[PDB]
Amino acid sequence: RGVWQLKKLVVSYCNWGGSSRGIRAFMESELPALKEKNPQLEVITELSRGQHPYLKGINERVVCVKNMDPEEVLLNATRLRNSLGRKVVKLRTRHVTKHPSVQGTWTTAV
Amino acid sequence: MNKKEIFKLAKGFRGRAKNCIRIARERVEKALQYSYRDRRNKKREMRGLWIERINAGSRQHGVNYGNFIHGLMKENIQLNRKVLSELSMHEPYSFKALVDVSRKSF
Amino acid sequence: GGLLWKRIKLTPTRKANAKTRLRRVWQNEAVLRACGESDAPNPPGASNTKSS
Amino acid sequence: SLNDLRD
Amino acid sequence: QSLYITLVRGLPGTRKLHRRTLEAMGLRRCHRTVLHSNNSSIRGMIDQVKRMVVVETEEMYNARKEAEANHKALRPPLVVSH
Amino acid sequence: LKKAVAGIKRINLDGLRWRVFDARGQVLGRLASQISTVLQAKDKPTYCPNRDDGDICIVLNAKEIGFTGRKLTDKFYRWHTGYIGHLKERSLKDQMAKDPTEVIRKAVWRMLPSNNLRDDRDRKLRIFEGGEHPFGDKPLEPFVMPPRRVREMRP
Amino acid sequence: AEKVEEAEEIGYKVMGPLKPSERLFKPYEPVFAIVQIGSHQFKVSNGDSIFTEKLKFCDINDKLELTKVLLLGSASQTIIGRPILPDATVHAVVEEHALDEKVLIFKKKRRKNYRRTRGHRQELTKLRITDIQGIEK
RNA sequence: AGGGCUCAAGUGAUUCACCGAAGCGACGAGACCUUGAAAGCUGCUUUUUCAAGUGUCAGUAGCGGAACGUUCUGUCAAUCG
């Protein structure tokens, strides 16, 4: 299955207040590197005054980054970048299949 | 807090074990230990589950489980139990060839 | 007689493990009693690995 | 500077 | 001669002396193998725990491993095609 | 009575297999364990333990049957009727002159695994102490016991 | 990064190129090969998925060539390999190199004031298996 | 324990396999400690990155380290509504 899947991302953050220092540093620090690596993303990096900071992606996947730090916020962006649109549902079976065989499945015949 | 993230797991319980707390905490404080016993228990529960198949679908071809595995380990087929069971399940002809190869020891 | 400590009977498939540890310590003291000097007189690879 | 002080 | 010893059968239930003696040489967990020059301080010292560890292998253990590699090494493929 | 002996095969799934165990008159337990397998579907590869795919296995001629030693007149069957005091007991000679089917039916019942599919397995088992059976027109596979009978002999 | 190379190959894989567009993912599905990764086997045909365990040195939209192969089987044709590779190739590809789920361990001793709580996650790589060779078909 | 076992599925002796545990391994994840390497430290030697550890990592009482939250109050004639 060849396609990109994270079809859009947001980094909502603040500009006044000590909470969003980590995400602000993240902004100038490692946005451009990841972005130049990933053109397929629509990384629209808007703001939201006075509110505790978070990230969002494709559905809706939200990740708070309050009182966090850039070295980790980079990973917490690359998570979302690798991710699907999945909801977290504990694995059913490790190898999904619609065709399990070439020989016929076992019946009264050998 | 925990006071509601219990009432998140509690879905499905019977009695007042789903609404009230002083009872929810109990059927749930077990409802985790059982899951510990089975994330240590399924890995083995399934183990025996596998052999039974191979056992049956080879005893169909004469070789008994012990002879089968003996022959295969000795002539170096490091295929392992899960996929041996899946071929037992889904591949009568290749599995039959396997049984013959392991009869090519004893 | 109050608390029932059962008596496991020594059975052929336990005799199995008996003779197992027997042949094991046999090799063990065998190579030790060989080492009555700093020599290497013990035939290579006495089983030690079929121990199972 | 009144929200930075530590020990 | 260079004997190579290797713990087996476990250490949870044992006389304290053997645990300390086993520990003194260096075996500290099951299925571990250490190597010493015998010198009659080790042959004796670890003779107190021959019951505990079935094997106190000599310098010909390499041969056992040599055989293992051959057993585990690759050989030409088999084709059936019924 | 064709009706009263043809059983409830109108209840199971039919579409898997019909197989015939005819004890040649040899031995209870060595007939039995073989049954408790075949009549538990653990003998074919596609086993899965939350279901009944037990094949139809049909035993024949329980009159001609052999039980060694002299248990026949020694091992009774015991059963308790609830009413205080009582313990209704019946030797195997009695049981065999009564109905030599019940014997093996009860035996395999006890051997089968102790779960609530046990009755729902015996719902896939039928018996005639003859060779005469009306379950012939159906696809009939007579069965052979394992080739594992050395039969040690004594003076 | 040749330590990375060797490490992947002793994990039985090797990361080839990226992929702009080649039109793989055909429906031809008549062959099965028994491929092993790092103490975790899987029987496979063309197009299946397989979850994995942090296939370490790869990333989005990569074609791995897992050098391990245990047995190739067509209709009744059994190139019955002995674990090492007789030149068979298993070309596969990564998507969704991301986490799985929260799983709760919580241990308690029936009457001891000891109620340790915890948390845990695991990240995995859904290999969409694509190609296989060494067969009759 | 029962089914039921002499047509051993019993006993005494010899031989192979197999199964089998949260053991030990295989990948993989963390925490601390060790080992380096490299920094920075001003101390010129404590303090963070990495990487290597068949290093370690059951626990009451009890003890040491780190963390979450809550009400208030400075940061705030600030900021959101």
Side-chain angles (χ1 to χ4, degrees), chain E residues 15-44:
Chain E
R15 308 180 79 277
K16 283 171 65 168
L17 261 38
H18 313 168
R19 293 182 183 174
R20 301 210 260 252
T21 260
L22 228 41
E23 162 138 18
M25 68 193 88
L27 264 184
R28 206 153 330 207
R29 261 190 174 191
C30 295
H31 310 280
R32 289 192 166 193
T33 84
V34 301
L35 177 63
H36 289 139
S37 64
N38 41 333
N39 80 45
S40 41
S41 286
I42 288 153
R43 308 197 289 160

Side-chain angles (χ1 to χ4, degrees), chain A residues 1-5 79 81-84 86 88-91 94-103, chain G residues 25 29-30 32 40 43-44 48-51 59-61 73-75 95-99 101 123 128:
Chain A
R1 282 302 144 74
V3 62
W4 294 118
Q5 276 299 114
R79 296 291 176 83
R81 179 260 171 179
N82 304 281
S83 48
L84 273 199
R86 203 180 305 189
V88 292
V89 289
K90 162 184 174 286
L91 163 65
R94 286 227 162 162
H95 182 65
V96 315
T97 182
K98 315 308 171 191
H99 288 167
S101 193
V102 53
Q103 324 181 21
Chain G
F25 321 104
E29 206 148 354
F32 72 89
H40 270 253
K43 193 264 278 185
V44 80
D48 283 334
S49 317
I50 306 172
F51 269 43
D59 212 310
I60 319 297
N61 286 135
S74 312
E95 202 176 3
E96 180 51 7
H97 179 117
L99 269 177
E101 164 76 50
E123 185 159 1
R128 302 301 297 266

Side-chain angles (χ1 to χ4, degrees), chain E residues 74-76 78-82, chain G residues 75-80 82 84:
Chain E
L74 177 63
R75 292 173 296 180
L78 266 155
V79 170
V80 172
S81 268
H82 28 283
Chain G
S76 165
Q77 304 62 60
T78 68
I79 292 88
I80 179 65
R82 287 182 211 158
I84 306 102

Side-chain angles (χ1 to χ4, degrees), chain E residues 36-82:
Chain E
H36 289 139
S37 64
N38 41 333
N39 80 45
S40 41
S41 286
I42 288 153
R43 308 197 289 160
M45 146 166 97
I46 294 169
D47 184 1
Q48 172 184 317
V49 300
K50 54 162 194 305
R51 258 187 164 181
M52 190 161 305
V53 49
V54 295
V55 307
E56 262 208 32
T57 203
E58 66 304 343
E59 264 303 36
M60 300 319 173
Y61 109 112
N62 170 29
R64 260 186 38 210
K65 267 158 45 191
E66 272 175 314
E68 293 179 21
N70 313 348
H71 189 30
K72 304 303 161 206
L74 177 63
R75 292 173 296 180
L78 266 155
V79 170
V80 172
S81 268
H82 28 283

Side-chain angles (χ1 to χ4, degrees), chain F residues 87-136:
Chain F
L87 165 77
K88 200 177 294 296
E89 199 172 5
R90 193 181 316 172
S91 68
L92 248 49
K93 168 171 168 58
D94 280 340
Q95 188 61 243
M96 292 286 297
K98 263 198 188 190
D99 49 343
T101 173
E102 170 82 19
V103 195
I104 307 103
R105 192 188 285 95
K106 175 177 298 199
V108 193
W109 177 279
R110 303 213 177 88
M111 273 174 203
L112 290 154
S114 157
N115 62 95
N116 64 69
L117 278 192
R118 212 167 67 231
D119 45 2
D120 307 341
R121 278 205 175 293
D122 183 33
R123 270 199 167 190
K124 282 178 158 202
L125 163 59
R126 300 287 98 103
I127 292 183
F128 316 90
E129 46 274 50
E132 157 176 357
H133 60 58
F135 301 91

